[PDB]
C-alpha cells in the first residue's frame, strides 16, 4: 500500500526529535525545549526536556502528555489505521483541553511535522483557573507516571481524529489527581490521510533526572503500542 510505504520510509530507523513549548499558567510564564529520538519500529521515544526560563511553575508530570503519537508502534495488521504517520511529512495539529479535577485546565495547541530529517513538536500551552495552593501550582504531585490507554476515534467531518482519556497523577499523600484529556488532531496539508477504525494506544512512561543537569528538567522514556483491533 503506497500510503503505508510513505509513513514507513519516513519513520524507518531512529528519527531525531525537537520539542518547543511556550507556556503561561495563571500568568506564570515559562518555556521548555526538548531533544531526543524516536524509533517507531519499537514504539520507543527517549526525550530530555529543559525549562529554559528557570523553575518550571507546574509539576513536570502534568506536561508529559503535551510533550508525539506518530512514533507509536502500529502492529502490521493495524497499519491502515495509523492516521499520525499518514499526515507526514506536512504534519498535523494536535489540540487539547486538559481538565484537572477540582483545579484548573490546560488548553494546548501543537503542530507536529518534519523540518528536514527532524520531527518537530511546537506547542503553545495556556492554563487558567488554577489554585495557587492546589496540587499543580503547589507542586504536590509525585515524580512518576502510570500506564494508560488512549482511545482514538475518527472525526470524519474534519478529516482527522478525536481522542479522549483520563490520566491519574499520584499525589504526595497517596491520593490521585485526575486530568481528563480531550483531544482533536487534523492534518496540516491538503493531502489524504488514513482515518482509523476505533482503537487505542497503550502507553508506558518512565520519568528520571540527568544527574549532571543543574537546570530544572525531565528525562522521559515512553513506549507506545497500538492495539484493540484483532
Q: How far apart are CA 126 and CA 163, in angstroms?
A: 20
Q: How far apart are CA 187 and CA 169, in angstroms?
A: 30
The region that residue 52 occupies, defined by phi over 0 for left and psi between -120 and 50 for alpha, beta otherwise, is alpha
Q: How far apart are CA 19 and CA 118, in angstroms?
A: 10
Residues listed for the chain: 230
Q: How far apart are CA 156 and CA 140, in angstroms?
A: 40
Q: For residue 33, how far is the Cα from the chain centroid?
A: 14
Q: How far apart are CA 92 and CA 84, in angstroms?
A: 7
Technique used to solve these coordinates: X-ray
Q: For residue 223, how far is the Cα from the chain centroid?
A: 12
Residue 207: CB atoms within 10 A of its CB come to 16
Question: What would you measure as the largest C-alpha separation in the chain, in angstroms?
Answer: 54
Q: How far apart are CA 150 and CA 111, in angstroms?
A: 19
Q: How far apart are CA 98 and CA 106, in angstroms?
A: 5
- Is the domain covering 1-230 a CATH 3.40.50.740 domain? no
Q: If DSSP states are collapsed to H, E and C, what string results for 139-190? A: CCECCCCCCEEEEEEEEHHHCEEEEEEEEEEEECCCCEEEEEEEEEEEECCC
Q: Which residue has the cell 493531502?
A: 191
Q: Are the C-beta atoms of 144 and 61 separated by less than 8 Å?
A: yes
C-alpha cell at 152: 482514538
DSSP codes joined into one string, 83-102: HHHHTTTT-EEEEEEEEETT
Q: What helix, strand, coil percent values describe the chain, rounded to 5?
A: 15, 50, 35
Residue 198 phi/psi, 5-degree rounding, is: -50, 130
C-alpha cell at 201: 494506544
Q: Which residue has the cell 502490521?
A: 76
CA distances for 230 relative to 48, 59, 223, angstroms: 35, 38, 20
Residue 75 phi/psi, 5-degree rounding, is: -50, 150
Q: How far apart are CA 30 and CA 40, in angstroms?
A: 30
Amino acid at each position: 500500500d503506497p500510503m503505508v510505504s510513505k509513513g514507513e520510509e519516513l519513520f524507518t530507523g531512529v528519527v531525531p526529535i525537537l520539542v518547543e513549548l511556550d507556556g503561561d499558567v495563571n500568568g506564570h510564564k515559562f518555556s521548555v525545549s526538548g531533544e531526543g529520538e524516536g524509533d517507531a519500529t519499537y514504539g520507543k521515544l527517549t526525550l530530555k526536556f529543559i525549562c529554559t526560563t528557570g523553575k518550571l511553575p507546574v509539576p513536570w508530570p502534568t506536561l508529559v502528555t503535551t510533550f508525539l503519537m506518530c512514533f507509536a508502534r502500529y502492529p502490521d495488521h493495524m497499519k491502515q489505521h495509523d492516521f499520525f504517520k499518514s499526515a507526514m511529512p506536512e504534519g498535523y495539529v494536535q489540540e487539547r483541553t486538559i481538565f484537572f479535577k477540582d483545579d484548573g485546565n490546560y488548553k494546548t495547541r501543537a503542530e507536529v511535522k518534519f523540518e528536514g530529517d527532524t520531527l518537530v513538536n511546537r506547542i503553545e500551552l495556556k492554563g487558567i483557573d488554577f489554585k495557587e495552593d492546589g496540587n499543580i501550582l503547589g507542586h504536590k504531585l509525585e515524580y512518576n507516571y502510570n500506564s494508560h490507554n488512549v482511545y482514538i476515534m475518527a472525526d470524519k467531518q474534519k478529516n482527522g481524529i478525536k481522542v479522549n482519556f483520563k490520566i491519574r497523577h499520584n499525589i504526595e499523600d497517596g491520593s490521585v489527581q485526575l486530568a481528563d484529556h480531550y483531544q482533536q488532531n487534523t492534518p496540516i496539508g491538503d493531502g489524504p490521510v488514513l482515518l482509523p477504525d476505533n482503537h487505542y494506544l497503550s502507553y508506558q512512561s518512565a520519568l528520571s533526572k540527568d544527574p549532571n543537569e543543574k537546570r530544572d528538567h525531565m528525562v522521559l522514556l515512553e513506549f507506545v503500542t497500538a492495539a484493540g483491533i484483532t
